[PDB]
């Protein structure tokens, strides 16, 4: 599944290189009418990231989410800044099909275990963003990926497992906004270790051989941001490169 991503700071729609805050480039303040286009050229799901809500939880777009969200008819993600239960069910209650949740599943593990006896498994992804230190270990970052958290995605993966973890996000912080194509081999090792989890692969499609290059991992879904906003393929290209991958 081609995964479509806009990012938003304060309405408009953004690129942040590596995640960086301070390397911003601008794409306007309409992402309605751009989800729509995809939507039109046959986005099955949509994936949003509230980032100036990911930056401070407390600064949240709620009024922009609900809109975009009303605003297609087919399913949407959002994550960002999600902190409680009651952020939870409020973003479920106005329609989101899933939401996205990195921060706090690492930092309070009986905290979000409720949630998915709460909600169900089906409703929840954890977002396993990482930065892959020089002995390889898949460190996962959290507060808008400002803060290295000293966790190994493998770890959180096996928390949340018996309580039935099910979607899993999983970017390379390093290639996210960069065009240089998305981390393969991490793929290849995630979703074999895991075959009961549907990851989503996210960060770095520049073109689409990239996503082709995907074809072989095992990813359930395949997140692509920049590319489409810069007009390298479109949305229709890519989901007929992965229908025929
Ligand atoms: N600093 C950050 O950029 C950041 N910080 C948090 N997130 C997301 O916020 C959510 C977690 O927020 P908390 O629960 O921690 O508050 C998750 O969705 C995280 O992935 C962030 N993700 C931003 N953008 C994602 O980066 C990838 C870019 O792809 P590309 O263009 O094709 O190369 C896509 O998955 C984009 O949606």
Redesign the pocket.
Known sequence: MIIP?L?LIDGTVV??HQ???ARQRDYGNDPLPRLQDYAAQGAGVL?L?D?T??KD?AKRQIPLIKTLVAGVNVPVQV?????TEEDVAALLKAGVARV?????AVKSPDVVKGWFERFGAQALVL?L?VRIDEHGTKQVA?????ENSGVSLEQLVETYLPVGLKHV?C?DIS?????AGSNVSLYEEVCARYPQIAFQS????GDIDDIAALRGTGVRGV?????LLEGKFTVKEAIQCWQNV
């Open positions: 991503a990012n690129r942040l995640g960086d805050y994936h990231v980032l809500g990911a939880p994550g960002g800044g999600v902190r996205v949740i990195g921060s706090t977002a963003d959290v507060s808008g990926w400002q996000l970017t290639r996210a906004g960069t065009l996210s960060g770095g499609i997140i692509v941001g920049r590319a």
